[PDB]
Amino acid sequence: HMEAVQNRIVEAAERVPGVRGVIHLRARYVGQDIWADMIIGVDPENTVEQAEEICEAVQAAVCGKIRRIESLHVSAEAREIGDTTKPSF
Amino acid sequence: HMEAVQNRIVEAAERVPGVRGVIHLRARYVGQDIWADMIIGVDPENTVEQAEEICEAVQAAVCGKIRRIESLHVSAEAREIGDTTKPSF
Ligand SMILES: [Zn+2]
Ligand SMILES: [Zn+2]
DSSP: OHHHHHHHHHHHHHTSTTOOOEEEEEEEEETTEEEEEEEEEEOTTSBHHHHHHHHHHHHHHHHHHOTTEEEEEEEEEEOOTTOOSSOOO | OHHHHHHHHHHHHHTSTTOOOEEEEEEEEETTEEEEEEEEEEOTTSBHHHHHHHHHHHHHHHHHHOTTEEEEEEEEEEOOTTOOSSOOO
């Protein structure tokens, strides 16, 4: 159920290089399949293009490890090292 | 109601420099107040820090013109000029 699944999504995303934590995550079942949207933190100095490449890696990683996800939208926001101005999981 | 409001949110955001269209927008009433989350397109060559500054400008612009919004979360994804690989409003 959703709490365990969300934990596994977060652990998988945080293993991808360039990820500075997960800031936002929403997920729901549609039938037996999971639809999720997440926002990861990344280095503010990355270009937006580089951040997209990180989000694509997260998408492959998370989808690759969690069978039951049918759709996973990943995008990014700026996160400086150690900053406490944004939420995290 | 939500369709007119969403139109006005989109028009306001698209007047802010650095915005390459609105890609995603979700909004709901909580009581008489509006809570919204949006994703704007920006130049892939922007840094993530520059994209955040654009999102902050959108937030001031939209909130400044639409009284009834209590919370508006804005973040960004890469959008190349004329590209058709992402949705838009
Ligand atoms: Zn998107
Ligand atoms: Zn955020």
